[PDB]
Amino acid sequence: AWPKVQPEVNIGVVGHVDHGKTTLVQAITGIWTSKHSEELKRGMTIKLGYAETNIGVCESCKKPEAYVTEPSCKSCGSDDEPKFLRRISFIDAPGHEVLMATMLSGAALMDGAILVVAANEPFPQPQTREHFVALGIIGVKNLIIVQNKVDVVSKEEALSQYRQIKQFTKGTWAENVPIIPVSALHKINIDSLIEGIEEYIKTPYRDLSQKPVMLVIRSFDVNKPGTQFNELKGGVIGGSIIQGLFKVDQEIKVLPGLRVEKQGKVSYEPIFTKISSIRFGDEEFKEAKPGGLVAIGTYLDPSLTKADNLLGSIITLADAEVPVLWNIRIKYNLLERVVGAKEMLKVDPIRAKETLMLSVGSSTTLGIVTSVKKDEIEVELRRPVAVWSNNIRTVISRQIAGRWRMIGWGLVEI
Amino acid sequence: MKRRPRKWKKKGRMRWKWIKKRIRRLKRQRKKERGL
RNA sequence: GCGGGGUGGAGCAGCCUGGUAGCUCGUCGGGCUCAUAACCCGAAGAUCGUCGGUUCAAAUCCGGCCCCCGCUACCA
Ligand SMILES: Nc1nc2c(ncn2[C@@H]2O[C@H](COP(=O)(O)OP(=O)(O)NP(=O)(O)O)[C@@H](O)[C@H]2O)c(=O)[nH]1
Numbered sequence: 140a141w142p143k144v145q146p147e148v149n150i151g152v153v154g155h156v157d158h159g160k161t162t163l164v165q166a167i168t169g170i171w172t173s174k175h176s177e178e179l180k181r182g183m184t185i186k187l188g189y190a191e192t193n194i195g196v197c198e199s200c201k202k203p204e205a206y207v208t209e210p211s212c213k214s215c216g217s218d219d220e221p222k223f224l225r226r227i228s229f230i231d232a233p234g235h236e237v238l239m240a241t242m243l244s245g246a247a248l249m250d251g252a253i254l255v256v257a258a259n260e261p262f263p264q265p266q267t268r269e270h271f272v273a274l275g276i277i278g279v280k281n282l283i284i285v286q287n288k289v290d291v292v293s294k295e296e297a298l299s300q301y302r303q304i305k306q307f308t309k310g311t312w313a314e315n316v317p318i319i320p321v322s323a324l325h326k327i328n329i330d331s332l333i334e335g336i337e338e339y340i341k342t343p344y345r346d347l348s349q350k351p352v353m354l355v356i357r358s359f360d361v362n363k364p365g366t367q368f369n370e371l372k373g374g375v376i377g378g379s380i381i382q383g384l385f386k387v388d389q390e391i392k393v394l395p396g397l398r399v400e401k402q403g404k405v406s407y408e409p410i411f412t413k414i415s416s417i418r419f420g421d422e423e424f425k426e427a428k429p430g431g432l433v434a435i436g437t438y439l440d441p442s443l444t445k446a447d448n449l450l451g452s453i454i455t456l457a458d459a460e461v462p463v464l465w466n467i468r469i470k471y472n473l474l475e476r477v478v479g480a481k482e483m484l485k486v487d488p489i490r491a492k493e494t495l496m497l498s499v500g501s502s503t504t505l506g507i508v509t510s511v512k513k514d515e516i517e518v519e520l521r522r523p524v525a526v527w528s529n530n531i532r533t534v535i536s537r538q539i540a541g542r543w544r545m546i547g548w549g550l551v552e553i
Numbered sequence: 554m555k556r557r558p559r560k561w562k563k564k565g566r567m568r569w570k571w572i573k574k575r576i577r578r579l580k581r582q583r584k585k586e587r588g589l
Numbered sequence: 590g591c592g593g594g595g596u597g598g599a600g601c602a603g604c605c606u607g608g609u610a611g612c613u614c615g616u617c618g619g620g621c622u623c624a625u626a627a628c629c630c631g632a633a634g635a636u637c638g639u640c641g642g643u644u645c646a647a648a649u650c651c652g653g654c655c656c657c658c659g660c661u662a663c664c665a
């Protein structure tokens with residue numbers, strides 16, 4: 140029996156609809172990513188998703204079929220029990236630009252990036268554009284290309300679009316990201332796929348020095364409809380530990396969390412608690428270390444947490460420092476063209492008073508402005524920020540036909 | 554509002570009460586609206 | 590595992606309880622005002638996907654086939 144551990148990795152998956160993200164994570168996990176009811180019936184990625192798997196290699200066999208996720212080695216036919224490499228995490232973005240913006244939340248938590256490509260769709264595809272350039276934003280340039288639908292493409296058009304792949308990477312930071320043939324529904328060589336996720340995407344250097352912050356992505360209530368008052372629980376609040384480490388029964392404050400009317404204006408409350416338990420799914424551990432979306436069940440009220448109220452929450456210590464500011468100064472860098480769309484028009488130097496969407500790592504808000512400096516922006520909000528230190532990645536999107544697409548990547552100066 | 558009572562006469566215009574109320578919805582604004 | 594309507598230009602009413610597609614927005618035209626719109630009334634209008642069965646006799650009760658297809662196995 141594998142001696143249990145919590146993950147070490149995050150691999151957020153980006154790409155458009157029909158490019159093959161749902162069944163590729165079905166393929167690397169054994170389970171799916173479309174986790175809502177109207178989603179269940181309609182069939183489009185609506186949730187910022189998540190996924191987990193194990194890795195055990197059989198040292199005896201050839202390259203590579205050893206990498207399958209159970210304590211056995213007869214996928215490649217090896218008699219041995221495999222050596223363990225890690226338990227893994229894949230964070231699942233939407234495809235549509237009618238649902239693009241929100242995804243940038245999870246982006247602040249990827250130890251890599253995955254782009255899936257349509258090999259039965261001409262060049263260039265609409266939303267993979269925006270996905271890959273937002274990756275270029277998040278400071279995680281680690282990309283995993285897959286050319287998908289090797290089972291409806293002719294075996295030459297695949298090669299032409301493969302050239303187109305190596306080319307699309309030329310001229311962007313990802314000249315040195317792979318191209319491995321696997322596909323979504325047909326599980327074709329997902330094994331050397333995980334081999335490539337291991338070989339090409341390395342671990343980003345972990346550090347336990349700054350304040351341990353879990354930049355949340357999900358938050359839910361365990362209590363089933365009709366749960367008696369005796370086995371009642373708090374809420375689960377779920378992120379991953381990038382700086383530090385969190386522990387069950389630990390004093391913590393969550394931010395922003397709860398909003399309250401204090402002195403006639405609008406303001407929030409950073410909320411103290413301790414953790415009721417920690418887990419990644421269905422195994423028992425007690426103190427979350429770096430690696431993977433960890434779930435932290437707390438001592439709060441559950442109604443505070445259901446229906447993704449604090450989407451992109453942050454957790455740090457109730458004796459710690461992360462600021463909140465209604466007026467935020469952000470140094471912003473303009474995007475070069477309309478990436479994720481059919482149509483790409485010029486990027487205009489604007490004046491203020493326009494209403495733009497500013498997503499703070501895993502946080503998000505609207506904003507307007509009065510002084511529009513050349514390089515930075517002084518934006519007024521309705522809800523304060525989650526900014527653990529300098530120049531954290533908050534992104535700006537402007538409306539395009541109801542699709543809020545990127546117009547710059549900004550870093551928060553405080 | 555430093556009334557000027559030549560306007561209520563309603564001759565070739567609109568009521569005054571329901572214009573005051575609408576000027577408030579813009580003074581409250583240019584005061585709040587990034588007039589900081 | 591299934592399972593539903595199988596309806597005029599449009600809401601589909603109406604299906605074990607069996608003979609008049611059944612009213613309603615819309616298209617033609619006729620009335621009232623000075624003239625318009627509201628308002629009034631005739632007319633057009635499918636005839637139940639379709640092969641059947643049951644049924645003196647039908648959407649009405651039961652089936653062949655097919656239209657579109659609507660619910661099939663999530664809370665740290
Ligand atoms: N056999 C096969 N089917 C595929 C492949 N890629 C997509 N499909 C099929 O195409 C349909 C839609 O593609 P989908 O898998 O949803 O791609 P996606 O990029 O994950 N879309 P989304 O993330 O919005 O759900 C599904 O029926 C899916 O099974 C592929 O490589 N092989």
Ligand SMILES: [Mg+2]
Nearest residue numbers: 160161183184
């Ligand atoms: Mg999907």
Ligand SMILES: [Mg+2]
Nearest residue numbers: 557558559560
């Ligand atoms: Mg006077």
Ligand SMILES: [Mg+2]
Nearest residue numbers: 622624625626
């Ligand atoms: Mg008339």
